[PDB]
């Protein structure tokens, strides 16, 4: 078959050789280090928990996950941040169980 480069379609565009470079160092940001993770959870046992997430853990303990998601969404804003907060706020709930189980 005779194929040609096209400006439309599923594989449109001029054809070049994509070289591979090192990833840009501005893109690194947001990654945890072993030291800042230690600092943040160190501040976590020193401080404790906020009053709204203390209520949300009580909501997640009785397995009302949808109401816990809606409460966290109304309290902090967006659905993505609500899901990310609920996942860590249930992982700490599971961590408190395996510490007191044995």
């Amino acid at each position: 078959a005779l194929r040609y480069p096209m400006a439309v379609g599923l594989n449109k565009g001029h054809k070049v050789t994509k070289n591979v470079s090192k990833p840009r160092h501005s893109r690194r940001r947001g990654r945890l280090t072993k030291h800042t993770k230690f600092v943040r959870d160190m501040i976590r046992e020193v401080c404790g928990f906020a009053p709204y997430e203390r209520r949300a853990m009580e909501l997640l303990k009785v397995s009302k996950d949808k109401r816990a998601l809606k409460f966290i969404k109304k309290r902090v804003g967006t659905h993505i941040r609500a899901k990310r907060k609920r996942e860590e706020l249930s992982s700490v709930l599971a961590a408190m169980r395996k510490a007191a189980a044995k």
């Binding site: 005779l2 040609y4 096209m6 400006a7 439309v8 379609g9 599923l10 449109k12 001029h14 070049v16 050789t17 994509k18 070289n19 470079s21 840009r24």
Partner: protein, 210 residues
């Protein structure tokens, strides 16, 4: 009141436009001032080129201009690293550098590397001490023939590859260009819904086995 036939015009003269009127009676005065400043700068950098540092080979985005080529702001760090030029020394010998640029392609990268090599071959470098020559610099016979360049350094010119009149083959006579354009447009438009319908067809028919 409108006349018989004409345009509906909307003149934007409802504010106090007469206060902010910019007249151009100092245009031939600013042209002389810019020319005198340009010549004073050209005399200040006496063997250095009057345009400044060399600008790289750069493609234009935004499909109206993607066939043209242009002078960019600076050579990228990948280009300088392949060419073997340190980024804090390149600005001292008239190489324009910006660190924001990326290199998605290979052909433009190697074109700018060749651009750096050909400028490095043309660079006539004076010793830092005029009374005593150094290692990586030009000899005394080139410094006395060293002049000042006028215009941009290595000017950027759009080249087109000339092609022979070729004998048309039978498979080039069978290529349907408009049919290929229409079917490629349809296959780009209908790609997601075809995959979702195939997923539903594979999901409804796997319920039969279980």
């Amino acid at each position: 009141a409108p006349s018989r036939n004409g345009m509906i015009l909307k003149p934007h003269f409802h504010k106090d436009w007469q206060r902010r009127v910019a007249t151009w009676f100092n245009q031939p005065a600013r042209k002389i001032r810019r020319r005198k400043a340009r010549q004073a700068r050209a005399r200040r950098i006496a063997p250095r080129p009057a345009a400044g540092p060399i600008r790289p080979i750069v493609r234009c985005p935004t499909v109206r201009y993607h066939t043209k080529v242009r002078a960019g702001r600076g050579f990228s760090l990948e280009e300088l690293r392949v060419a073997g030029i340190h980024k804090k020394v390149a600005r001292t010998i008239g190489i324009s550098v910006d660190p924001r640029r990326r290199n998605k392609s290979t052909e433009s990268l190697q074109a700018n590397v060749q651009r750096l090599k050909e400028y490095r071959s043309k660079l006539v470098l004076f010793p830092r001490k005029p009374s005593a020559p150094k290692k990586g610099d030009s000899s005394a016979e080139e410094l006395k023939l060293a002049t000042q360049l006028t215009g941009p350094v290595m000017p950027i010119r759009n080249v087109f590859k000339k092609e022979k009149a070729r004998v048309i083959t039978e498979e080039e006579k069978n290529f349907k260009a408009f049919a290929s354009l229409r079917m490629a447009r349809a296959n780009a438009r209908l790609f997601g819904i075809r995959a979702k319908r195939a997923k539903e067809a594979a999901e409804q028919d796997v319920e039969k086995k279980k």
